[PDB]
From Swiss-Prot:
Function field: Chromatin reader protein that recognizes and binds acetylated histones and plays a key role in transmission of epigenetic memory across cell divisions and transcription regulation. Remains associated with acetylated chromatin throughout the entire cell cycle and provides epigenetic memory for postmitotic G1 gene transcription by preserving acetylated chromatin status and maintaining high-order chromatin structure. During interphase, plays a key role in regulating the transcription of signal-inducible genes by associating with the P-TEFb complex and recruiting it to promoters.
Disease named in the record: Cornelia de Lange syndrome 6: A form of Cornelia de Lange syndrome, a clinically heterogeneous developmental disorder associated with malformations affecting multiple systems. It is characterized by facial dysmorphisms, abnormal hands and feet, growth delay, cognitive retardation, hirsutism, gastroesophageal dysfunction and cardiac, ophthalmologic and genitourinary anomalies. CDLS6 inheritance is autosomal dominant.
Tissue: Ubiquitously expressed.
Cross-link Glycyl lysine isopeptide (Lys-Gly) (interchain with G-Cter in SUMO2) per UniProt, renumbered positions: 58
Record-stated family: Belongs to the BET family.
Protein's name in the database: Bromodomain-containing protein 4
The record's account of how the chain is modified after translation: Phosphorylation by CK2 disrupt the intramolecular binding between the bromo domain 2 and the NPS region and promotes binding between the NPS and the BID regions, leading to activate the protein and promote binding to acetylated histones. In absence of phosphorylation, BRD4 does not localize to p53/TP53 target gene promoters, phosphorylation promoting recruitment to p53/TP53 target promoters.
Summary of subunit composition and partner proteins: Interacts with p53/TP53; the interaction is direct. Interacts (via CTD region) with CDK9 and CCNT1, acting as an associated component of P-TEFb complex. Interacts with RELA (when acetylated at 'Lys-310'). Interacts (via NET domain) with NSD3, CHD4, BICRA and ATAD5. The interaction with BICRA bridges BRD4 to the GBAF complex. Interacts (via NET domain) with JMJD6 (via JmjC and N-terminal domains); the interaction is stronger in presence of ssRNA and recruits JMJD6 on distal enhancers. Interacts with NSD3. Interacts with NIPBL. (Microbial infection) Interacts with bovine papillomavirus type 1 regulatory protein E2. This interactions may serve for the tethering of viral genomes to host mitotic chromosomes allowing successful partitioning of the viral genome during cell division.
Cellular localization per UniProt: Nucleus; Chromosome
Domain Bromo: 17-123
The encoding gene: BRD4
Domain statement: The NET domain mediates interaction with a number of chromatin proteins involved in transcription regulation (NSD3, JMJD6, CHD4, GLTSCR1 and ATAD5).
Additional information: JQ1, a thieno-triazolo-1,4-diazepine derivative, and I-BET, a benzodiazepine derivative, have been tested on tumors with success. Treatment with GSK1210151A (I-BET151, a I-BET derivative) has strong effets on mixed lineage leukemia and promotes myeloid differentiation and leukemia stem-cell depletion.
Length: 127
């Protein structure tokens, strides 16, 4: 029933970079999704205690959320764009794994994912 610690957002020994693609992922992709009317359920780790979902972290073994992504981007935690893109995809996929088609939370994820895909279609070439 208990919540796990959140995903790591700081690790001094992890090699990391700031690339133009990672800057786009913060300034365009994260910013666009974060301001969306459906962002709020995804802006922090799921509190499975307060939502009374004792099975949540028993089923979702690789949790991810945009609060964590935002911190990772702000801290320049990533090595490359694909690592960050993977975090977004994990977040969406986790939603579809845990919930049912047509559930409000799924509709919310689908709207965010549509925008995500539109923005990453225009990811700049690495300079
Ligand atoms: C990211 C994420 C992924 N998956 C889920 N699943 C989920 C499934 C069932 C429920 N409940 C169904 C109704 N019960 C009375 C309480 C439990 C739930 F709260 C969440 N939750 C997520 N975040 C999240 C964050 C905060 C809120 Cl308040 C919501 N609630 S909600 O999904 O019902 C909605 C956003 C539509 C109000 C979800």
């Amino acid at each position: 029933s208990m919540n796990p610690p959140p995903p790591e957002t700081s690790n001094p020994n992890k090699p990391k970079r700031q690339t133009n693609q990672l800057q786009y992922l913060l300034r365009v992709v994260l910013k666009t999704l974060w301001k969306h009317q459906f962002a709020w359920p995804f802006q922090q780790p799921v509190d499975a205690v307060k939502l009374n979902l004792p099975d949540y972290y028993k089923i979702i073994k690789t949790p991810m959320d945009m609060g964590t992504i935002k911190k990772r981007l702000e801290n320049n935690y990533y090595w490359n764009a694909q690592e960050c893109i993977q975090d977004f995809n994990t977040m969406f996929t986790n939603c579809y794994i845990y919930n049912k088609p047509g559930d409000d939370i799924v509709l919310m994820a689908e709207a965010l994912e549509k925008l995500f895909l539109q923005k990453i279609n225009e990811l700049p070439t690495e300079e």
